[PDB]
Design a binder for this molecule. Structure first.
Ligand SMILES: Nc1nc2c(ncn2[C@@H]2O[C@H](COP(=O)(O)OP(=O)(O)OP(=O)(O)O)[C@@H](O)[C@H]2O)c(=O)[nH]1
Length: 1073
RNA sequence: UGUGACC
């Protein structure tokens, strides 16, 4: 509830010269008071009359009404930022050392020195690409500095540490003035020219870093990173986070968690001695020297200190540095440089080929339907991303231009041009338009924006491999419904005094030109074997067209822009843009380690406890017959690196007996760690989401970081949200959304009023507002309807249908239509219409709901019904689980020490339902969890027509539709769909064991009725309420349920008429994918 | 229509 208040201290801070609180109430007479108070307030302000009287006069509204929004009327020239910044600029501005970076443009020169003219300029290399200004990030900081000016004791040491650092920014910024941004939140030439090219993005990186400073060690790390990061823009992060790969092999294991047969974490009190060959210490020092030579001082000592004893208890510092290294910003080079960096393989290609076979064998041998109708599968899965060229399109009586695949597939069909039989060339004659991938730390990488013919030809076969992966443990990233905790235990499992883990980063190998041949070759070779396993025209064709793209790509040409020119150079490496990218890379990376391990066995004899490939890393745990020694480690480590060398693969390969470090995670001292390097004030690229959407994503990013071990002051986060979600009515009148508006479970939710706890409307006003917002959730788009009606479209939707369905089916059909209408949202013009509407709507909205004939039910209502039939009473749970994830805040860790954690993802798509399994045996169609949710609630005879109308044979449709499974499915679909709506797999909850016995105790639910659905929700709602209470108070409570029998049937009905809510908060979570 | 693949 503090938002609404911290919101005023802010406005009254930014503006000095008025605020007009706007309330509302579900109660008619109180609302009319809410209306009167409003106007009376406007009036007095329109006369410079103190509102003090009215605030007393209408004290009733203040007290019993819900704050809807705070109106801010300010008449300043909005340069108050410039003015306000002086006070903090009394330190010596930083002077960029233009010597630290290789490429010249990476050095912090003046903009003009890099770009002499306005036609040569480009923010392309610094663009914060986010929808909030640098002025704001500035205002935010100062606002907070003022509020914690007179704080005492420790808060002061936090204020101080912070005030200091801000100066560095403030002073440096003041020297060249503050860079003003345009309506699109971009920094142009006129403003950037005189100022250092990287002033802005660095300011942003530095602000976000200093506002995440608390302890002295923080401050030390910030300050250091903030200074060097003003000159170094290319090796800092890599330099700072490089040591961590070795630090993990130095901490002894004193009690760890392993994985048991039930594939779940189980404590193991074992001790494993970290065995390290001297050479490693050399390597680690060489890394410490490099750290120093590049200016670093404070950070290198922290590690050197740590290295005396190397206590897993004093490892939180090392982890902290590793996570901070990333907040320096992204490394955005020039496409050209990004692209320029570019007989013993016999074994390595044989394995790749054998792996491509295993995966597709059965599907091929048994003329799988998916492999046959793969062309339809690709079409239905086609996204509305780029195709490469910017074609002119004819829709109805309108010719517009677009690059969208969905737009090009359509147009192409309506003109006999749709020809997937012909897989376009990608050579010198038809160069690949390029894309990029920017990440903090590593150098930029290019990306092939291949023609849609390439997706379609690969979609189905890729999916068939991913399935083989789903149940092959070696593929960590894909195995079962597993989260990272599982992979954590699979390693710590076989560890001991006679084994050694071998990890390897191979990101450089996959881009290496050496790989590109044995890679594409092994796949093709494999595809051949498969082709010889059938005669099915369908299979051979799609199996063949796959072989085709694996050739056109062998000798590929790329379109690198080199200025305002687009040179065509020859690309001889495997870039990524295909559908097989992730799968193939997984296949390849694993084929590799197998190749390496196989070779080193000629000398040393060991056993393979586990082999794994996960993203751009690949590791294995070997076991020897004798106790391992420093010398044994050195030898293995050498023969390995040497084996990799004989393949001309530039890769980092380490060998330890206690931990590992890979891009996704690292295991130090038997504990699990995940880098907390998600940037907040700078983004990789510009999407299409709105500001609100970005507000929510900021917050989301805050939560993930926080859980990972990097906390940005929440007061700062809330300030940014106050900024980003606002809506300007005129040049002076700006409207600010209230806490109720932004946190309630609506279509406009941005964040949770309290971290790790998701509330739902439990009061009338809350219900009122919730139902009001939903009413204006989806907006009209003239442009979207125009094409939604055009011929090529209807024909498109039609052609897809007649191809999928056998008999009639209106649910599918009505779906395919919308499913395709939505894709148009990637088209900017439409997107823009939408947002404009949403604003005006949500504009008048924050003024008077009322008229909204609610009739739709949501998870809120369901819960709000159940709420009153429970009795809480103080309970208690002892801490009985040792911590394995050190970084977790304290209130979230607690829940785990009491009820435990999980290593799987709760099924929330209805994929395990029998009916869904059925449809996938005879159909290429994929129904959402929300469709199955309705299809399962249909009259027995309707479900039978659905099934048949998708190619499901009667002996099957008729058999299922009756069976007991249909009933169990009925429950399973609902059970799955509800979890989906409660976000049981996100943020905080995904961590918890919702089936913990310890938890089950606190839940006392007398089953006065044998009606599964109701029993279900009652227990879950209770498990949630218990855990929330524990997440806030630190103590536990028990729940007793006295839900009526009569009511149960009333509820069960409500259950099957639930609507899914769509919001920025929701999408934010989906973005964490 | 300052936009730039897979997932
Ligand atoms: N290209 C690529 N991007 C990835 C990969 N894995 C994750 N990402 C990125 O992941 C960001 C998502 O971060 P998350 O995966 O949601 O962080 P998290 O993994 O959900 O934290 P949890 O897994 O507990 O463990 C996106 O912006 C992606 O670009 C990958 O293997 N390849």
């Amino acid at each position: 509830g503090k938002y609404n208040l911290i919101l005023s201290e802010y406005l009254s801070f930014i503006y000095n010269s008025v605020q007009i609180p706007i309330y509302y109430s579900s109660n008619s007479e109180l609302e009319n008071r809410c209306i009167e108070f409003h106007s009376k307030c406007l009036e007095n302000s329109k006369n410079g009359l103190s509102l003090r009287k009215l605030f007393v006069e209408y004290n009733d509204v203040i007290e019993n009404a819900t704050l809807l929004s705070i109106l801010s009327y300010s008449y300043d020239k909005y340069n108050a930022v410039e003015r306000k910044l002086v006070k903090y600029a009394k330190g010596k501005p930083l002077e960029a050392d233009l010597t630290v970076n290789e490429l010249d443009y990476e050095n912090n020169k003046m903009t003009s020195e890099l770009f002499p003219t306005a036609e040569e300029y480009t923010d392309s290399l610094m663009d914060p690409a986010i929808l909030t200004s640098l002025s704001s990030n500035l205002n935010a900081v100062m606002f907070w500095l003022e509020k914690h000016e007179n704080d005492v004791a420790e808060k002061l040491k936090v204020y101080k540490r912070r005030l200091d650092l801000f100066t560095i920014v403030a002073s440096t910024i003041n020297k060249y003035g503050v860079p003003r941004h345009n309506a699109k939140y971009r920094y142009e030439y006129d403003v950037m020219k005189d100022k250092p090219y990287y002033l802005v993005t660095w300011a942003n990186s530095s602000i976000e870093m200093l506002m995440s400073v608390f302890s002295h060690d923080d401050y030390l790390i910030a300050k250091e990173l903030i200074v060097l990061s003003y000159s170094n823009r290319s090796t800092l992060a890599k330099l700072v986070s490089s040591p961590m790969s070795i630090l993990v092999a130095l901490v002894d294991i004193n009690g760890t968690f392993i994985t048991n047969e039930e594939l779940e974490l189980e404590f193991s009190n074992k001790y494993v001695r970290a065995i390290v060959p001297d050479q490693t210490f050399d390597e680690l020092n060489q890394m410490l020297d490099n750290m120093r030579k590049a200016g670093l001082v404070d950070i290198p000592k922290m590690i050197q200190d740590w290295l005396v004893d190397r206590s897993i208890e004093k490892f939180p510092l090392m982890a902290k540095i590793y996570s901070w290294s990333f907040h320096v910003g992204f490394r955005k080079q020039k496409m050209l440089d990004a692209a320029l960096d570019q007989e013993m393989y016999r074994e390595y290609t044989m394995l790749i080929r054998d792996e491509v076979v295993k995966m597709l064998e059965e599907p091929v041998k048994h003329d799988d339907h998916l492999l046959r109708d793969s062309e339809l599968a690709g079409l239905l899965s086609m996204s509305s991303a780029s195709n490469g060229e910017s074609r002119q399109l004819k829709f109805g009586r309108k010719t517009i231009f677009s690059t969208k695949k969905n737009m090009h597939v359509m147009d192409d069909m309506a003109n006999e041009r749709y020809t997937p039989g012909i897989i376009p060339p990608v050579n010198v004659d038809k160069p690949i338009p390029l894309g990029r991938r920017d990440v903090p730390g590593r150098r930029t990488r290019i990306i092939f924006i291949l023609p849609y013919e390439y997706f379609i030809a690969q979609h189905a076969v890729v999916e068939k491999m991913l399935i083989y992966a789903k149940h092959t443990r070696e593929y960590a990233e894909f195995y079962s419904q597993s989260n990272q905790l599982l992979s954590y235990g699979d390693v710590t499992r076989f560890l001991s005094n006679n084994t050694m883990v071998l990890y390897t980063d191979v990101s450089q190998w996959d881009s290496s030109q050496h790989n590109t041949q044995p890679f594409r070759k092994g796949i093709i070779m494999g595809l051949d074997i498969l082709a010889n396993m059938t005669n099915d025209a369908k299979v051979l064709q799609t199996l063949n067209l796959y072989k085709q793209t694996q050739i056109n790509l062998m000798d590929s040409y790329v379109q690198i822009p080199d200025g305002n020119v687009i040179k065509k150079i020859q690309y001889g490496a495997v870039a990524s843009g295909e559908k097989q990218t992730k799968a193939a890379n997984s296949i390849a990376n694993l084929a590799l380690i197998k190749t390496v391990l196989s070779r080193i066995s000629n000398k040393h004899s060991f056993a393979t406890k586990i082999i794994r490939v996960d993203g751009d890393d690949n590791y294995a745990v070997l076991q020897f017959n004798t106790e391992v020694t420093k010398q044994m480690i050195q030898d293995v480590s050498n023969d390995v690196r040497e084996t990799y060398a004989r393949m001309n693969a530039k890769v980092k390969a380490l060998v330890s007996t206690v931990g590992i470090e890979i891009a996704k995670r690292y295991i130090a001292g038997g504990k699990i760690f995940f880098r907390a390097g998600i940037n907040l004030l700078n983004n990789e690229k510009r999407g299409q989401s709105t500001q609100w959407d970005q507000a929510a994503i900021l917050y989301s990013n805050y939560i993930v970081n926080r859980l990972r071990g990097f906390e940005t002051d929440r007061e700062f986060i809330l300030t940014k949200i106050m900024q980003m979600t606002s809506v300007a009515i005129t040049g002076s009148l700006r409207l600010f959304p209230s806490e109720r508006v932004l946190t309630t479970n609506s279509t406009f939710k941005v964040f949770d009023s309290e971290d790790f706890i998701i509330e739902y409307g439990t009061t009338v006003d809350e219900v009122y507002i919730q139902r009001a917002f939903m009413s204006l959730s989806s907006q009209k788009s003239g442009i979207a309807d125009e094409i939604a009606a055009s011929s090529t479209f209807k024909n498109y939707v039609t052609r897809l249908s007649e191809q999928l369905l056998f008999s009639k089916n209106n649910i599918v059909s009505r779906g395919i239509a919308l499913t395709e209408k939505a894709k148009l949202n990637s088209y900017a013009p439409i997107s823009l219409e939408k947002r404009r509407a949403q604003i005006s709507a949500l504009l008048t909205m924050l003024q008077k709901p009322v008229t909204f004939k609610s009739s739709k039910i949501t998870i809120n209502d369901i819960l709000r019904d159940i709420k009153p039939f429970f009795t809480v009473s103080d309970a208690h749970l002892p801490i009985q689980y040792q911590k394995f994830m050190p970084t977790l805040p304290d209130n979230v860790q607690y829940i785990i020490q009491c009820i435990g954690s999980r290593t799987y993802q709760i099924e929330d798509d209805g994929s395990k339902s029998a009916i869904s399994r059925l449809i996938s045996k005879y159909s290429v169609y994929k129904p959402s969890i929300e469709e199955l949710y309705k299809v399962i609630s249909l009259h027995e005879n309707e479900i039978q027509l659905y099934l048949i109308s998708l190619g499901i044979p009667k002996i099957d449709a008729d058999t299922y539709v009756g069976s007991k499974i249909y009933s169990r499915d009925k429950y399973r679909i609902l059970e799955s769909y509800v979890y989906n709506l409660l976000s049981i797999n996100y943020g905080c909850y995904q961590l918890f064991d919702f089936n913990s016995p310890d938890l089950e105790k606190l839940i006392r639910i007398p089953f006065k009725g044998k009606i599964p659905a109701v029993t279900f929700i009652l227990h879950l709602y209770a498990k949630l309420e218990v855990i929330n209470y524990a997440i806030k108070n630190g103590s536990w409570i028990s729940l007793f349920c006295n839900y009526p029998k009569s009511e149960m049937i009333k509820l069960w009905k409500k259950m099957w008429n639930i609507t899914s809510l769509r919001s920025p908060y929701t999408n934010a979570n989906f973005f964490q994918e």
